[PDB]
């Protein structure tokens, strides 16, 4: 059984970051926008887009 390692995703509240490759056996990244849907949080990021 594998163990998934997440180092922690780089999250910019009201910004963005492009993927930087790192050498791991099944290294995969994706850049994901949103993070938090609009009107869904109580101390969430202001930017939901």
């Amino acid at each position: 059984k594998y163990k998934t390692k997440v180092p922690s995703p780089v999250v910019k509240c009201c910004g963005a970051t492009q993927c930087t490759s790192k050498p791991h056996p099944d290294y995969q990244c994706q850049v994901f926008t949103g993070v938090y849907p609009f009107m869904w949080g109580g101390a969430y990021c202001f930017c939901d887009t």
Binding site: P37, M39, W40, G41, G42
Partner: protein
């Protein structure tokens, strides 16, 4: 209303020997293609004395109008439910089975819980099931509600709901024949039909590594797999 306080309502059935309860559920929405349910009822979550909040509720206990922090006071449908948003007159929760909606106080000497019968179903909008969107898998259309207080009312809308993805679909091209080595880890509905003037009219739900050979007349084929966005070929190389 949202700022209006809970009140006694007809429902003379509780699980204890006290049954003088609120709750009758004015309206409920739960005929979504999500997993979440919006309830409009007296025994209001999202309302304390401060008006509309996201993590406090108010209730008539059977005769005691008060507010508390959510402790041993639980919403349920046919299973426990952990709320997602509270909006005054409206409760919003993730409640996976749906159907019956049960708001209850599991307090000491007076333990009231009302359940109201309703048809709250969560179903495909396409052919992939929804009943509790997780956070892993492809986002697909669904009905949902706004999940933050606007104090405007919570009413139906359409949003995006996660549904499970499956492993790599290994396609193998051959001449006038496309064998699809498919490897679900989870129930995928495999629908095929050709994108030619031939057809492959085969719906089947599949699980686990299998092969399925299909005809191609020289115009490929469409296969939708898991109701995930179609994998389609139009070649005679297919």
């Amino acid at each position: 209303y949202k700022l209006a306080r809970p009140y006694i309502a007809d429902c003379p059935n509780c699980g204890h020997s006290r049954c003088d309860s609120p709750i009758a559920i004015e309206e409920v929405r739960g005929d979504a293609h999500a997993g979440v349910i919006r309830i409009q009822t007296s025994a209001m979550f999202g309302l304390k004395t401060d008006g509309v909040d996201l993590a406090y509720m108010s209730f008539m206990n059977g005769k005691t109008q008060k507010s508390i922090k959510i402790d041993n006071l639980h919403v349920r449908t046919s299973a426990p439910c952990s709320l997602v948003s509270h909006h005054g007159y409206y409760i919003l929760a993730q409640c996976p089975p749906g159907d019956t909606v049960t708001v209850g106080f599991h307090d000491g000497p007076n333990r009231h819980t009302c359940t109201v019968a309703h048809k709250v179903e969560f179903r495909p909008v396409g052919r992939e099931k929804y009943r509790h969107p997780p956070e892993h898998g492809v986002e697909l259309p669904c009905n949902r509600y706004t999940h933050k207080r606007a104090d405007v009312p919570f009413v139906p809308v359409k949003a995006k709901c996660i549904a499970t993805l499956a492993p790599e679909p290994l396609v193998e091209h051959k001449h006038r024949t496309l064998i699809l080595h498919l490897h679900p880890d989870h129930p995928t509905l495999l629908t095929t039909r050709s994108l030619g003037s031939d057809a492959n009219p085969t719906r089947q739900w599949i699980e686990r590594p299998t092969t399925v050979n299909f005809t191609v007349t020289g115009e490929g084929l469409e296969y939708t797999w898991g109701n995930h966005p179609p994998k389609r070929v139009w070649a005679q190389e297919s």
